[PDB]
Design a binder for this molecule. Structure first.
Ligand SMILES: Nc1nc2c(c(=O)[nH]1)[n+](Cc1ccccc1)cn2[C@@H]1O[C@H](CNS(=O)(=O)C(F)(F)F)[C@@H](O)[C@H]1O
Lengths: 14, 191
C-alpha cells in the first residue's frame, strides 16, 4: 500500500 | 540504463479520488445539485486541485465539498455507502473561523495518505457541509457492522484532528438517518 505522513504530503503544497 | 524514477515520476496515491461540489440551489433536486469537479491519483495532482479552489470557510451557505474514492458516488444510496455510516464532526459558529479549514484539510490528508492502515478499505470518502447554523465534517465508511474498522477509524480521526479527549464524536448509520422518527439520529458508536 502507498501510505503517506501528513508532513510529507504538506511538503508538496508549494 | 534508464533514468531514476525518483527524479521525475509523480508520487502515486493508493487510490484515485474524486472531488465533488454541491451547490445550494433549491430550484433543483439534491442529486442535480451534486456535480463532479475532477479526479486525481498523485500527491502533485491533489495539490494542483486544492490550491486553486476556495477554502470551505469561503463557500456560500448550504454548499458541500465531498472527496470520495473513484467509483463511489457521494450519496448514501451508493452500493458502497448504503450499509455504512459516518463519523460526524459538528462545529459551532465560531469554529468556522478557527477550525473548519484546518479540519477539512486534515481530513483530506487522512484519506489520500491512507492513514487508517488495515481499515483503509472501509473508508469511502468525506464530506464538509458549510452551514449557517454550524458547519459539519464527516468521514463515511462502508459497513456499520464492521465494529473494529469503524472504531479504529474514529479514534485515529479524532486524534488527527487534535480534538480534546472530552469532545465526543459520534458515528451515525445512513439507514438510521434515512428512517428515524424525530430529528435526532442515534449514535451507533462514540469516541
Ligand atoms: N437522496 C439523498 N439526499 C441527501 C443525501 C443523500 O446522500 N442522498 N444527503 C447526504 C447525506 C446522506 C446520509 C446522511 C446525511 C447526509 C443529503 N441529502 C439531502 O437531505 C435530505 C435527506 N435525505 S438523506 O439522504 O440525508 C437521509 F435519507 F439519510 F435522510 C434529502 O432530501 C436531500 O435533500
Amino acid at each position: 500500500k502507498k501510505r503517506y505522513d501528513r508532513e510529507f504530503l504538506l511538503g508538496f503544497q508549494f | 540504463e534508464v533514468a531514476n524514477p525518483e527524479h521525475y515520476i509523480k508520487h502515486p496515491l493508493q487510490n484515485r479520488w474524486a472531488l465533488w461540489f454541491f451547490k445550494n440551489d433549491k430550484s433543483k433536486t439534491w442529486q442535480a445539485n451534486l456535480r463532479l469537479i475532477s479526479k486525481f491519483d498523485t500527491v502533485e495532482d491533489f495539490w494542483a486541485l486544492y490550491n486553486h479552489i476556495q477554502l470551505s470557510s469561503n463557500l456560500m451557505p448550504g454548499c458541500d465539498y465531498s472527496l470520495f474514492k473513484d467509483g463511489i458516488e457521494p450519496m448514501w444510496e451508493d452500493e458502497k455507502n448504503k450499509r455504512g455510516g459516518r463519523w460526524l464532526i459538528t462545529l459551532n459558529k465560531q469554529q468556522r473561523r478557527s477550525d473548519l479549514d484546518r479540519f477539512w484539510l486534515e481530513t483530506l490528508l487522512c484519506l489520500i495518505g491512507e492513514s487508517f492502515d488495515d481499515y483503509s478499505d472501509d473508508v469511502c470518502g468525506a464530506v464538509v457541509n458549510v452551514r449557517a447554523k454550524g458547519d459539519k465534517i464527516a468521514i463515511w465508511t462502508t459497513e456499520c457492522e464492521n465494529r473494529e474498522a469503524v472504531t479504529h477509524i474514529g479514534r485515529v480521526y479524532k486524534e488527527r484532528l487534535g480534538l480534546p479527549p472530552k469532545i465526543v464524536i459520534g458515528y451515525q448509520s445512513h439507514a438510521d438517518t434515512a428512517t428515524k422518527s424525530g430529528s435526532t439520529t442515534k449514535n451507533r458508536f462514540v469516541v
